[PDB]
């Protein structure tokens, strides 16, 4: 009944008081060594499961080496969510981060 809607409304409002907006986030604009290992991990784990690839793969059979080529041209469609230690988070996309 409505007792679900009383709980979903709380869950998403609580998830609205943790989202820091794009003008007010105060973490680093760099891709911090662990995003890059997990972005190339997760994107290669998608390409091996028939994801749409946005790079001209030229005979590269390794799924991890494909993701390393989707990263160099900013073609990876992922979003990092940086958790601050009270729970609140900043959503940094992969195109706007700066890779090492």
């Amino acid at each position: 009944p409505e007792d679900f809607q009383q709980h979903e409304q709380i869950r998403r409002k609580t998830l609205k008081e943790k989202a820091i907006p794009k003008d007010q986030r105060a973490t680093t604009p760099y891709m911090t060594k662990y995003e890059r290992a997990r972005i190339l991990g997760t994107r290669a784990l998608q390409i091996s499961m028939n994801a749409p690839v946005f790079v001209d793969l030229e005979g590269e059979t390794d799924p991890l080496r494909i993701a390393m080529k989707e990263l160099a041209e900013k073609k990876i469609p992922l979003v990092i969510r940086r958790y601050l230690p009270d729970g609140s988070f900043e959503d940094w996309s992969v195109e706007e981060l700066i890779v090492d």
């Binding site: 105060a26 973490t27 680093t28």
Partner: protein
């Protein structure tokens, strides 16, 4: 569970804060190896400029801000140089305590700042001094500890591993590992 957070603080896994910066200045040990070797960086300026490439980098991080605040705190500290530590007036807290090192260019620990001044002042050498600060203050920014780094484990391994090297006897004071067990 002690790890660097995204605000450079050193916090336990449950959130109970341990430190506010790693070491005082949030530098990885495996990055500060040539950080004060200023003579090596001036020789290799053009080769190190396109490692720390500032051209595709400056519109994402603030340049003018922490340079302005550092020269307040530098000159003001040069006033009260002979006053003792308990009479130090605390108008100007350090620039790392106000500005994120990985976001504001020039926000630099006060010990790296003085060594860079003491190199540029005591040495007159197609490189200016404005473009050597802006590389060595970019090298500082690209040599910071990353968030999520397991500094709790690394600090506990860097003590426990070279204590497999001090097991020996007198070649008074409690020596070696039984002092470290206390």
């Amino acid at each position: 569970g002690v790890h660097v957070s995204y605000d450079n603080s050193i916090r336990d896994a449950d959130g109970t804060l341990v430190q506010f910066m790693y070491g005082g200045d949030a530098i990885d040990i495996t990055k500060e190896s040539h950080m004060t070797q200023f003579e090596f960086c001036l020789d290799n300026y053009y080769a190190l400029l396109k490692k720390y490439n500032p051209s595709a980098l400056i519109e994402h991080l603030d340049v003018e801000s922490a340079l302005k605040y550092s020269k307040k705190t530098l000159k003001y500290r040069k006033k009260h140089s002979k006053e003792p530590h308990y009479k130090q007036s605390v108008k100007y807290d350090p620039v790392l305590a106000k500005y994120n090192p990985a976001k504001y260019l020039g926000s630099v620990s006060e010990n790296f700042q003085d060594k860079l001044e003491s190199f540029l002042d005591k040495n007159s050498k197609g490189v200016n001094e404005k473009k050597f600060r802006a590389l060595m203050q970019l090298k500082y920014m690209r040599s910071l500890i990353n968030p999520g780094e397991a500094v709790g484990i690394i600090a506990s391994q860097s003590v426990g591993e070279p204590s497999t090297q001090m097991t020996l006897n007198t070649f008074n004071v409690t020596l070696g590992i039984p002092r470290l067990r206390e």
